[PDB]
């Protein structure tokens with residue numbers, strides 16, 4: 081098709097999109113289709129002549145929609161929020177026109193990482209605006225980022241021990257290397273240790289599911305005693321399981337003095353640190369060698385955006401593609417800092433709403449302190465009761481919740497995710513959960 | 527911003543984008559601004575209140591455009607891998623709104639069938655209810671080559687162990703050999719290193735095609751030296767020139783010698799939707815796997831690389847975009863698209879044959895012309911250097927044998943023979959100046 085025809089149809093698709101979004105509340109979030117429903121609906125071969133746009137869009141409604149998961153539904157309460165903003169869509173559009181994989185890309189990235197750095201109020205050591213030795217950079221995921229960090233640290237320690245002891249071979253050194261994370265850390269850490277070919281050990285967390293000084297130091301002594309070599313440690317701010325926070329201020333100086341590279345994975349919670357109410361949870365970065373979080377989670381930049389800063393950017397070269405700063409730029413300019421702060425606080429509020437609806441009911445309990453946007457709750461009593469509860473919910477198909485385990489407790493996770501969630505939805509949700517609970521607790525007397 | 531702001535600014539962006547594409551002829555293909563230009567044009571910190579859309583798009587022209595490459599220019603005469611058609615942009619827009627997905631798994635299966643029939647692969651390769659064999663979208667062609675090689679590795683190991691229970695996997699692998707043309711895309715070499723097997727190049731003939739004589743030789747030399755051939759990559763539309771391995775001669779030898787025959791159609795594979803070109807693909811019946819990237823010529827986004835196997839046992843929502851592109855051009859549209867480009871190629875080819883200073887190195891079949899200035903390597907390097915220096919068009923070189931070469935690829939959506947005329951005349955001029963200098 082020619083330019084002029086894209087105009088008619090692009091604008092049409094813009095309308096089609098807006099509609100889908102405006103009416104999204106109406107859709108059953110999860111698909112109920114029987115395998116192989118699709119093939120009969122689509123012809124055996126490609127068409128010789130072009131089809132009409134009318135026919136194709138109809139077909140998107142009739143054929144594709146029924147078979148897709150609508151995660152932008154405000155009724156999606158699983159995992160963590162996944163960024164989808166209209167400003168990013170507009171960027172993707174432009175970005176599709178230009179194409180990408182020169183200087184505007186690299187430069188807007190550096191400057192955007194500086195914008196974001198100033199927002200999270202990071203130590204100047206991570207910022208390269210005033211000529212600093214460190215800087216920011218966009219990765220595809222927290223996981224990739226953690227890997228990039230593990231491998232920079234690996235390279236580092238090798239270059240150190242070899243400088244001080246030339247006779248020493250790479251193979252012989254990596255045999256000894258040990259890395260760390262909290263027992264609450266994310267799989268991406270294990271992934272990294274295996275790719276990086278080193279040993280990974282978990283530190284036991286405390287009753288707030290946080291890594292502390294004493295526990296980390298036990299570990300280190302234990303492994304140094306056996307001749308192993310600490311080189312890398314990941315600290316999680318906003319664990320996947322229950323949004324708990326490693327004690328960065330306790331752990332930072334330890335890592336420093338033990339010549340252990342400290343990476344802070346803040347993939348979800350990191351977004352909230354642009355609000356002064358939450359910035360303190362980040363106190364400690366001072367000590368970190370690298371810091372990462374996912375704007376494509378809670379900062380409205382559409383997927384593929386992961387933000388990482390390092391104290392020494394040449395440390396990073398040791399590890400040896402797209403135009404993502406454009407999205408960031410659009411999102412930041414189209415919302416402003418204030419608007420972003422509001423986005424965050426609106427979720428946090430709604431999470432506290434749900435929280436206090438649960439407390440208020442003598443039958444339930446909160447399991448972890450509710451810090452920001454995730455609620456870990458439970459029906460008082462047996463696990464089995466709560467596995468029963470989650471079944472009912474997940475079977476009813478109105479909402480969907482993801483259980484986790486906290487030591488020995490089975491726990492239900494409610495997560496404020498979507499861009500358009502209001503107080504109304506959260507309430508509707510809690511109704512549904514509470515009907516189903518009473519049902520369960522009544523089938524408990526039989 | 528809310529949904530009705532987006533109905534407005536979204537349609538506005540549709541306009542900005544179309545304008546962009548339409549006037550693209552006029553833009554210089556390469557930035558003429560230095561790393562460092564951007565920071566001072568843009569404030570030091572993010573704004574507190576929302577900026578206006580109007581000020582943002584103005585900033586895109588004034589600030590972003592000078593700093594950007596413009597690979598969608600007709601004057602970009604190489605393969606732009608992240609190039610996209612309009613139907614693809616329409617798809618992306620929807621894909622954004624949407625974002626465990628039964629529709630995306632199943633559409634992909636049907637699209638692979640569509641592509642399949644378009645290329646008219648033998649019935650075997652079809653996943654269309656036949657049972658045996660089938661097709662899959664791999665990440666990239668490198669990833670495909672590696673998948674075939676692993677499948678092939680596994681096959682030979684089982685084969686040899688059934689015959690000789692004593693042989694160990696390790697003892698076997700140490701002796702395995704893989705082959706490909708000496709024009710084999712780099713991604714064969716990588717697949718071998720990861721598969722931990724020996725890779726040897728088969729020398730091509732006067733046409734840069736792999737032939738029986740050369741294949742048999744290597745199988746003889748290596749079998750006798752106690753090695754075991756197990757895998758080969760035949761290339762259809764090489765990445766240096768636009769060469770074509772002879773499947774008719776190579777195929778039968780593979781089947782006989784138990785060599786697994788993977789065909790790498792690369793970029794060229796798309797041309798086989800046209801009857802004129804299907805003869806270059808005769809031989810696939812012998813092949814065990816077949817791969818190509820439809821991005822190049824079937825106007826998709828390159829997240830896509832199609833691969834089929836004769837036997838399936840031996841082994842992001844992409845499908846939507848495919849569906850949109852195929853549904854929106856039609857087969858005939860797609861065909862006209864390849865055909866136009868081939869035509870532009872033969873037109874550039876003429877201009878080249880019509881100047882005695884230049885030669886043509888490889889038969890021009892598809893959208894690529896390999897030519898140079900008659901004479902010396904030195905000379906040509908100098909000509910390429912000053913073409914890129916002028917930044918008005920872009921070309922990439924390659925080495926065929928021992929000889930530097932200029933590749934002219936007609937690849938963009940908007941290319942017309944005017945752009946070709948204008949580019950050739952540009953290439954003549956700087957060749958004059960280059961020739962002069964050489965005399966000194």
Ligand SMILES: Cc1ncc(COP(=O)(O)O)c(C=O)c1O
Pocket residue numbers: 665666667668669711713761763764765790791792793819831
């Ligand atoms: C002949 C050939 N094989 C393999 C490849 C690799 O393609 P991809 O980058 O999609 O893996 C290319 C593309 O550049 C090619 O031209």
